[PDB]
Amino acid sequence: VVGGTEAQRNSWPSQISLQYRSGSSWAHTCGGTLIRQNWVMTAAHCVDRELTFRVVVGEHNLNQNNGTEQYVGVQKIVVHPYWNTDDVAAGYDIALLRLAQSVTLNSYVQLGVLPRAGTILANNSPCYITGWGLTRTNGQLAQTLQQAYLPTVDYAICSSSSYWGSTVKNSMVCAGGDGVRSGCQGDSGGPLHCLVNGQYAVHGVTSFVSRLGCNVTRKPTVFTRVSAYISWINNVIASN
């Protein structure tokens, strides 16, 4: 997250760190959201590589013992069947991970609440992105979980020629684009949290930014719109 601030350690208890085994250690690669005690939602492009993955819940500082982490292997990966890795702009950038064990819930570990199917945010709706991604374009991962305020940019604007044009679809949410705050590498798969009727819900799964940089004016961060995939998510969990 570029232009973020450190999150309080109990603000975003559905955030997870998806990590891969890297020699004798583990490395953060992307974010995700806990949606059942044994299921995580992330981006499809995050699990394109044939790596050994684990999920960490209750994480705050990737480089220090927080005393709150639970570590759990990934048992099954279900990517959306229409996902195509060489066309992220087509959409369907979503995947569900079944965990080897069910995690225990507490003030650091909670299920993300999802929006009702079909919900679309009005333009300029207040949202936060969260994650451990790069803190500058071509920078390094954050140590501590970051948050940045990214108001939504509606489809009519986002799909205009000076923004994303045809690259943005109605199955996506755009947020940000002010040139200072954005998602960045390592934030993929993590949540966009939006405040609606007094309650934060996860409306987006971080999908892409510009190839010209993370925080680029009129290139808001693009998220998979969770509310377009409620039936899909429910169908996968019920059949696994």
Known binding residues for Ca(2+) are: 59, 61, 64, 69
* Residue 66 engages Na ion in binding (rule: CB under 5 A): yes
With beta carbons less than 8 A apart as the criterion, state whether 194 and 127 touch: yes
Which candidate in 14, 17, 182, 188 is catalytic?
188
Closest CB to Na ion belongs to which residue? 66
For residue 15, the SS3 value is strand
Which candidate in 80, 93, 193, 207 is catalytic?
93
Span near Na ion by CB under 5 A; candidates 53-61, 73-81, 123-131, 149-157: 53-61
User: Does 60 participate in catalysis according to the annotation?
Assistant: no
Rounded least distance, CB 67 to Na ion, Å: 8
* Residue 37 engages Na ion in binding (rule: CB under 5 A): no
Rounded least distance, CB 26 to Na ion, Å: 11
With beta carbons less than 8 A apart as the criterion, state whether 170 and 119 touch: no
With beta carbons less than 8 A apart as the criterion, state whether 130 and 145 touch: yes
3-state SS of 46-78 is HHCCCCCEEEEECCCECCCCCCCCEEEEEEEEE
With beta carbons less than 8 A apart as the criterion, state whether 75 and 132 touch: no
Q: Which residues of 103-139 are buried (b: 16+ CB within 10 A; e: fewer)?
A: beeeebbbbbebbeeebbbeeebebbbbbbbbbebee
Span near Na ion by CB under 5 A; candidates 4-12, 66-74, 111-119, 168-176: 66-74
CB-nearer residue toward Na ion: 108 or 229: 108
Rounded least distance, CB 145 to Na ion, Å: 10
Interactions with Na ion, residue window 88-147 (CB under 5 A)? none
List the one residue from 61, 110, 143, 144 that touches Na ion (CB under 5 A): 61
- φ, ψ for residue 209, nearest 5 deg: -130, 175
CB-nearer residue toward Na ion: 143 or 171: 143
Tokens coding 23 = 């020699």
Which positions make up the binding site? 59, 61, 64, 69
User: Does 17 participate in catalysis according to the annotation?
Assistant: no
Give the position of tokens 């982490």: 69
Give, rounded to a whole angstrom, the gap between the first and last alpha carbons of the chain.
33
Span near Na ion by CB under 5 A; candidates 54-62, 100-108, 191-199, 229-237: 54-62
Rounded least distance, CB 217 to Na ion, Å: 34
Radius of gyration of the chain (CA): 16
Span near Na ion by CB under 5 A; candidates 55-63, 82-90, 113-121, 189-197: 55-63
Residues annotated catalytic, as ranges: 45, 93, 188
Q: Catalog residues that contact Na ion under the rule CB under 5 A.
A: 61, 66
